[PDB]
């Protein structure tokens, strides 16, 4: 619903808001899914994405308290191959806020299966990856977004996730 974040501070919201797609102008943030409210199975996440028509802002707070994530061009789904468009981007607040937009290098934006959700593929590590219990994650530099590692180390553990929609 239209409700506060439990993860993001006011100034963090404002930095994210400045990067949201023009198509979201005029829409309030809606909490579409949170691990706190809804649980940690990826199947629950995919269920929450059914029947939605909005880009989705995935916000991860890791066990070190760091915040990073992705703006996905469409609702998360299970896919045979990659999906999404160059509206998709990665972001981090560590060591300071920065959004990593599509670089034009490749089209491997988002990939979903029952065991994982990932961003920025094509060769080597994904830019951002989460397991099917929304608990173990990985992140790495990738060509799709031209990001460095988002968090402190390659592996992270999720403390909380929120997904925000805008329709």
Coordinates of C-alpha atoms in Angstrom, one line a residue:
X1 CA 0.0 0.0 0.0
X2 CA 0.9 3.7 0.2
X3 CA 2.9 3.5 3.3
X4 CA 6.4 4.4 4.7
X5 CA 9.6 2.5 4.0
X6 CA 11.2 0.7 6.9
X7 CA 14.5 0.6 5.1
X8 CA 15.1 4.0 3.5
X9 CA 15.8 7.3 5.1
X10 CA 14.2 10.5 3.7
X11 CA 17.3 11.6 1.9
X12 CA 17.8 8.1 0.5
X13 CA 14.2 8.2 -0.9
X14 CA 14.8 11.5 -2.5
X15 CA 18.0 10.3 -4.2
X16 CA 16.1 7.3 -5.6
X17 CA 13.1 9.4 -6.6
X18 CA 15.3 11.6 -8.8
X19 CA 16.2 8.5 -10.9
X20 CA 12.8 6.9 -11.2
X21 CA 11.5 6.6 -14.8
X22 CA 9.5 9.6 -16.2
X23 CA 6.6 7.1 -16.6
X24 CA 6.3 7.0 -12.8
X25 CA 5.8 10.8 -12.4
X26 CA 2.5 11.5 -10.5
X27 CA 2.2 8.0 -9.0
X28 CA 2.7 7.5 -5.3
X29 CA 5.1 4.7 -4.1
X30 CA 3.2 1.5 -3.3
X31 CA 4.7 -1.3 -1.3
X32 CA 4.1 -4.4 -3.5
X33 CA 6.1 -6.9 -1.5
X34 CA 8.2 -6.9 1.7
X35 CA 10.0 -9.8 3.4
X36 CA 8.9 -8.4 6.8
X37 CA 5.2 -8.6 5.9
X38 CA 5.1 -11.3 3.3
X39 CA 8.0 -13.8 3.9
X40 CA 11.2 -14.8 2.2
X41 CA 10.2 -17.4 -0.4
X42 CA 10.9 -16.2 -4.0
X43 CA 7.6 -17.8 -5.0
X44 CA 5.8 -15.3 -2.8
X45 CA 7.7 -12.5 -4.6
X46 CA 6.7 -13.8 -8.0
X47 CA 3.0 -14.1 -6.8
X48 CA 3.1 -10.5 -5.6
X49 CA 4.3 -9.5 -9.1
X50 CA 1.4 -11.2 -10.9
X51 CA -1.2 -8.8 -12.3
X52 CA 1.0 -5.7 -11.8
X53 CA 1.9 -3.2 -14.5
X54 CA 4.7 -1.0 -13.2
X55 CA 8.5 -0.8 -13.0
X56 CA 9.6 -2.3 -9.7
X57 CA 12.1 -0.8 -7.3
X58 CA 13.9 -3.6 -5.4
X59 CA 15.5 -2.4 -2.2
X60 CA 17.8 -4.7 -0.3
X61 CA 19.2 -4.0 3.2
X62 CA 22.0 -6.4 3.9
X63 CA 23.2 -7.8 7.3
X64 CA 25.8 -5.0 7.4
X65 CA 23.0 -2.4 7.1
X66 CA 24.0 -1.4 3.6
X67 CA 21.3 -0.6 1.0
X68 CA 21.4 -1.4 -2.7
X69 CA 19.1 -2.8 -5.4
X70 CA 17.6 -2.4 -8.8
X71 CA 14.9 -0.6 -10.7
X72 CA 13.4 -3.2 -12.9
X73 CA 11.6 -2.2 -16.1
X74 CA 8.8 -4.7 -15.5
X75 CA 7.4 -6.9 -12.7
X76 CA 9.7 -9.8 -11.8
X77 CA 8.9 -13.1 -13.4
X78 CA 10.3 -16.5 -14.1
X79 CA 11.9 -16.4 -17.6
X80 CA 13.7 -18.9 -19.9
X81 CA 16.1 -16.2 -20.9
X82 CA 16.8 -12.5 -20.1
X83 CA 14.1 -9.9 -20.1
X84 CA 13.6 -6.2 -19.5
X85 CA 14.7 -3.0 -21.1
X86 CA 17.3 -0.3 -20.7
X87 CA 15.0 1.5 -18.2
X88 CA 16.4 -1.1 -15.8
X89 CA 19.3 0.1 -13.6
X90 CA 21.2 -0.9 -10.5
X91 CA 21.9 1.3 -7.5
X92 CA 23.8 1.4 -4.2
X93 CA 24.2 3.6 -1.2
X94 CA 27.7 2.1 -0.5
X95 CA 30.1 3.9 -0.2
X96 CA 27.7 6.7 -1.3
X97 CA 24.6 6.8 -3.5
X98 CA 25.1 6.1 -7.2
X99 CA 22.7 4.8 -9.9
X100 CA 24.3 2.6 -12.6
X101 CA 22.2 3.0 -15.8
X102 CA 22.3 0.8 -18.8
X103 CA 25.6 1.2 -20.7
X104 CA 24.3 0.0 -24.1
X105 CA 26.8 -3.0 -23.9
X106 CA 24.2 -5.7 -23.9
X107 CA 20.5 -6.5 -23.3
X108 CA 20.9 -9.0 -20.4
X109 CA 19.0 -7.0 -17.9
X110 CA 16.9 -9.4 -15.7
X111 CA 16.7 -13.2 -15.3
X112 CA 14.4 -15.1 -13.0
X113 CA 14.0 -18.8 -12.1
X114 CA 12.5 -20.6 -9.1
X115 CA 15.9 -20.6 -7.4
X116 CA 17.0 -17.0 -8.1
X117 CA 16.5 -13.5 -9.4
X118 CA 19.4 -11.8 -11.1
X119 CA 20.4 -8.7 -13.0
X120 CA 23.1 -7.9 -15.5
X121 CA 24.2 -11.2 -17.2
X122 CA 25.8 -12.4 -20.3
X123 CA 29.2 -13.6 -19.2
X124 CA 30.8 -14.0 -15.8
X125 CA 29.0 -13.1 -12.6
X126 CA 25.7 -11.3 -12.5
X127 CA 25.7 -7.7 -11.3
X128 CA 23.2 -8.6 -8.6
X129 CA 21.8 -12.0 -7.7
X130 CA 19.5 -13.3 -4.9
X131 CA 18.7 -16.9 -4.1
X132 CA 15.3 -18.5 -3.7
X133 CA 15.0 -17.9 0.0
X134 CA 15.8 -14.2 -0.6
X135 CA 18.7 -14.7 1.9
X136 CA 22.0 -15.4 0.1
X137 CA 23.0 -12.9 -2.5
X138 CA 25.9 -12.0 -4.7
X139 CA 27.0 -8.9 -6.5
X140 CA 29.8 -8.0 -8.8
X141 CA 30.8 -5.5 -11.5
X142 CA 29.0 -6.2 -14.8
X143 CA 29.0 -4.8 -18.3
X144 CA 25.2 -4.3 -18.6
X145 CA 25.2 -1.5 -16.0
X146 CA 28.9 -0.6 -15.6
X147 CA 28.6 -0.9 -11.8
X148 CA 31.3 -1.8 -9.4
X149 CA 30.5 -4.2 -6.6
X150 CA 27.4 -2.7 -4.8
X151 CA 28.0 -4.0 -1.3
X152 CA 31.1 -4.5 0.8
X153 CA 31.9 -8.1 -0.4
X154 CA 30.9 -10.4 -3.2
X155 CA 28.5 -12.4 -0.9
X156 CA 25.9 -10.8 1.2
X157 CA 23.1 -11.9 3.5
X158 CA 19.7 -10.2 3.3
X159 CA 18.3 -8.5 6.4
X160 CA 15.2 -7.1 4.6
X161 CA 13.8 -6.5 1.1
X162 CA 11.1 -4.1 -0.1
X163 CA 9.7 -3.9 -3.6
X164 CA 7.9 -0.7 -4.6
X165 CA 5.6 -0.1 -7.5
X166 CA 4.2 3.1 -9.0
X167 CA 0.9 2.6 -10.8

